[PDB]
Design a protein around this ligand. Structure first.
Ligand SMILES: O=P(O)(O)OC[C@H]1O[C@@H](OP(=O)(O)O)[C@H](O)[C@@H](O)[C@@H]1O
Ligand SMILES: O=P(O)(O)OC[C@H]1O[C@@H](OP(=O)(O)O)[C@H](O)[C@@H](O)[C@@H]1O
Ligand SMILES: [Mg+2]
Ligand SMILES: [Mg+2]
Ligand SMILES: [Mg+2]
Ligand SMILES: [Mg+2]
Ligand SMILES: [Mg+2]
Ligand SMILES: [Mg+2]
Ligand code: NA
Lengths: 221, 221
């Protein structure tokens, strides 16, 4: 059986996309960039902080010094962190708490494989820390948006190979990253967005242990 | 007693999966899409031609016009049709010819409920057409994945309700389709693929009239 589930954070466990967006938008407007709208923001979902800033600078044909780049990312992060102070257990997505309980009861490892360096604080705000066996640290691994390294690290952090794991993602690039890791992806979202080459569910209420096991068994030949 | 048996084609009466696979892989290579391997191909079984092409495009997040999509499906089908020109009566799966004889002699209706538009040609190549009371036409009803409509149409084409029928399938989604139609499914293959809540035989040599009768009786209580 799969020995671990590797969880995305934003779009799976909860979603703080609106606050990421608002913080990026506010930063962009401050530095004279006006194109950071919700459509553009779709290109930032799932993407590292630094690659997100780079996409925003690129949009505006803007270039800044290394020092200024760090300052800008920090400014956005400080605003984001202010905005997520009131995240609570009520923000856990539908079905997720029960899934975590069931995985734990079945001694299946639970690892966070989020791009977000704010993951630990968010899990604490949601009272989920006790379920997580490990959190892969995005500062420690390759962080391009389709890079498999965060998923590989999450599996390894709980003593298992990606080949022995399921990964849950909302991002197209994250699904590709899971494939490249060797883990089995199960996406959450619409076919129009994620495609049909992997198993997807419409929303997290469909992520049950029974469903994960059914998919796993079918996919292991 | 049941009044009809609704037969899948590929994986039940014969299997042309290898030729479907080779034709899709050739098409994918022409358009520069990687990932159409034998493992991926498992998810194309019981899927319509168009839904199969969509999955392949989705491997690469490729988008095409409606005309381009039609052209690609046509090119794959042309290649597939060439590759099945040598199908013969020796390709009929084990036990199937005797089952057809026994059903006919017991005045049980026989209908094809395949997703494949190439079904009639294949039955002719195998010298089986005369055993079939009807062929449900997957160009005229929904027939991909878990669509019950192809099974409903097959039953109706021989004057019976699905509730009066057994359906035979090798695909998990096709088993679901049979269940949703109201017919009694009997799968062939792995429980790991098809489920633990229907009768499954390991291979088609187990599909005998006596066995179908025993299952029908057992499932009526
Ligand atoms: O390090 P941080 O600035 O907190 O977040 C990094 C990224 O985390 C991602 O989380 P996920 O991969 O969806 O869980 C978000 O989707 C993305 O919008 C964000 O830029
Ligand atoms: O219309 P065509 O391109 O000839 O075939 C459509 C589909 O027929 C299905 O037949 P079945 O449902 O297993 O008998 C095959 O399993 C599937 O792989 C194929 O794509
Ligand atoms: Mg996400
Ligand atoms: Mg992610
Ligand atoms: Mg609140
Ligand atoms: Mg089949
Ligand atoms: Mg079928
Ligand atoms: Mg031959
Ligand atoms: Na923990």
């Amino acid at each position: 059986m799969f020995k671990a589930v590797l969880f995305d954070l934003n779009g799976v466990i909860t979603d703080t996309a609106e606050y990421h967006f608002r913080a990026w938008k506010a930063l962009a407007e401050e530095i004279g960039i006006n194109g950071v709208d919700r459509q553009f923001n779709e290109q930032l979902k799932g993407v590292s902080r630094e690659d997100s800033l780079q996409k925003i600078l690129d949009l505006a044909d803007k270039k800044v010094s290394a020092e200024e780049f760090k300052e800008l990312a920090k400014r956005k992060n400080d605003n984001y962190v202010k905005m997520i102070q009131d995240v609570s257990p009520a923000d856990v997505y539908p079905g997720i708490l029960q899934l975590l309980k069931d995985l734990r009861s079945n001694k299946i490892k639970i690892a966070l494989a989020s791009a977000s360096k704010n993951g630990p604080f968010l899990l604490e705000r949601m009272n989920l820390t006790g379920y997580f066996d490990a959190i892969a640290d995005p500062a420690e691994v390759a962080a391009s948006k389709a890079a498999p390294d965060i998923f590989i690290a999450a599996a390894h952090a709980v003593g298992v190979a990606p080949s022995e794991s399921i990964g849950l993602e909302d991002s197209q690039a994250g699904i590709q990253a899971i494939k490249d890791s060797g883990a089995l992806p199960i996406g959450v979202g619409r076919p129009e967005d994620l495609g049909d080459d992997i198993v997807i569910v419409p929303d997290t209420s469909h992520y049950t242990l029974e469903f994960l096991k059914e998919v796993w068994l079918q996919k292991q030949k």
